[PDB]
Design a protein around this ligand. Sequence first.
Ligand SMILES: [Zn+2]
Ligand SMILES: [Zn+2]
Lengths: 336, 362
Amino acid sequence: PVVVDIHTHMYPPSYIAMLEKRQTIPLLPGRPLSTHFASLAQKMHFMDTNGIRVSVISLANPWFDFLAPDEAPGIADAVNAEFSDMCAQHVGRLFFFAALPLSAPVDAVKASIERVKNLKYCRGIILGTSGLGKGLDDPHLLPVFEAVADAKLLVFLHPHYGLPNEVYGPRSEEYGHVLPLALGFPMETTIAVARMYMAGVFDHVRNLQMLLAHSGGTLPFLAGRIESCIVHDGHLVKTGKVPKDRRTIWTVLKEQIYLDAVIYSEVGLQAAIASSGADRLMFGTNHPFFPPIEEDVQGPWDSSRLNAQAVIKAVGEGSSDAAAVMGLNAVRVLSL
Amino acid sequence: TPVVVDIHTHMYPPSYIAMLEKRQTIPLVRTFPQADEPRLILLSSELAALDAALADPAAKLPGRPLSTHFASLAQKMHFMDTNGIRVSVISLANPWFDFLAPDEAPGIADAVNAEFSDMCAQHVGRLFFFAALPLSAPVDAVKASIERVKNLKYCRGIILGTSGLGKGLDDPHLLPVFEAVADAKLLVFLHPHYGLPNEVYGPRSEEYGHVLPLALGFPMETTIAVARMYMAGVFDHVRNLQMLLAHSGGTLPFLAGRIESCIVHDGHLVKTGKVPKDRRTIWTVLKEQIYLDAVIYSEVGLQAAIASSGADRLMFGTNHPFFPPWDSSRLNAQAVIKAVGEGSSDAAAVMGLNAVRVLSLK
Ligand SMILES: [Zn+2]
Ligand SMILES: [Zn+2]
């Protein structure tokens, strides 16, 4: 009964080092930074306490997107080295998603892909929605998707930019970070994957595999609506973009898309399972972003247990589908 | 045998269309040489396609085709008879009266609402309507329109967008409007229109047609609006308020759990005492003050909507006549057969009986 967490983050000491040369951004305001973000000891302590055996860690947002094109490749190389080295400290319990210097020229990005492919304990790539600066449906980004897919690396798509702040209205500050995090993040994810599907990225790179943060954002709920809008669209019909042999979003959700379990609900989880299948769901925690305010921070976490109990509500404890989502799927797909 | 009710179905009265035919700014209706039917242009996402069509008469046709079905009450009844729909609760479609000048808004709103009442009178027992409010006008002019539609025959609720008076739905100046509507026992039908700022769809948005604004922008707009209402405490401040949400609440049934998790873990909210132990959760609101329409186009969506609000709070809709190829009305009826089952009490409830009870359709 191996338990694997595929949605878990760290800010390495080398990453925090360069964060304190900037007074622009990254930064009462914002989040408070603790040892849980930086200390690998605190990570393994969290894993032991919460019954987690193997973690596929990844750098948290904003990654390297804010960096200048000249410094970004060098910084990405150093941070990815740290990740590989951190994984070697606890062999068999730690793997990682590498981050790419997407603010650098395409050549440097493709060179990074070749390097991280040959880094120990690396099993994939984490990337945001901005791409090279014009989203994931940017034609210049196709050779990047092709290189990542050929390298046998899983793409972990993660939000950061959310939606433009105006949408939340002039009272947004009164609700804390609830609106950007609860809505902005999953909506950003959905738009990005929709733009990918509409541009035909999945068709052009059919070996590409995609893991989606927060159960696809809202994708499992909006998939049917997206399909209906596609088949009825006059512009797409006239231009011959909708033939009979066209791969529907449901087919892509079951052939090329994986979903995480960080949805905090059995309602949402049931929708995601019915979208991709119980074999294509993977348990996550989003550690260390949601710590208890009243309860002890060094003990068990509320965010991790809510996602765990939802699985038991969805597929039942003891069954093959439960052991798969909780870890055995990640072991299978990410070669652990 | 059980009565079928369509609660999501639209009309533009002829006078409303004529008003749009002479607009040079969105919303508008424009006739093109290469098309028989005029073009309906309602959205900010259509702005670029419009300007390109005016400069070059060879470019793709902007907006959507304006069929006769939008203004035809006869074609509405024909559609109902063909699909076995006994009752339609009709509503003015977006953008309603939002774009009207503050001075002329209440007068036009009063006239159009009276037309809708007269339309329903042509087919007694088969047509009811949601009214629209002159929300660009001062609050007292809005209030005056509420007590007017309160007295109108066959009026069963209010349809409104997400902009409110201009500051959204969490604007405290809008609270008395929610109160008045709730005190009048009128169901509020929240409906999308504004979507999301066009930049989120990227520089290739034109290549995808209407898919992204309609399939994503609309439901996301709805979700942000309701979340803003909820976070502001609108459901606590107006306890008798009942809300019908278009397209199964947008994304709300899927995101509800995430919203809840973010609230309890929000440091700023907990410290300011905005998260008490006796607070009404989003789950509670979804079962007490929120109804959802059954226009989701999937069994996955509908099942999630049923789990969130309950079968007694789901209501069948078609979005007639925004579906030109009649098949989406059959597709949305088909999902009910798989989710709860054909012939059951739950199906009969979703398909019409819930609407009969909640809207007092007699
Ligand atoms: Zn995360
Ligand atoms: Zn509609």
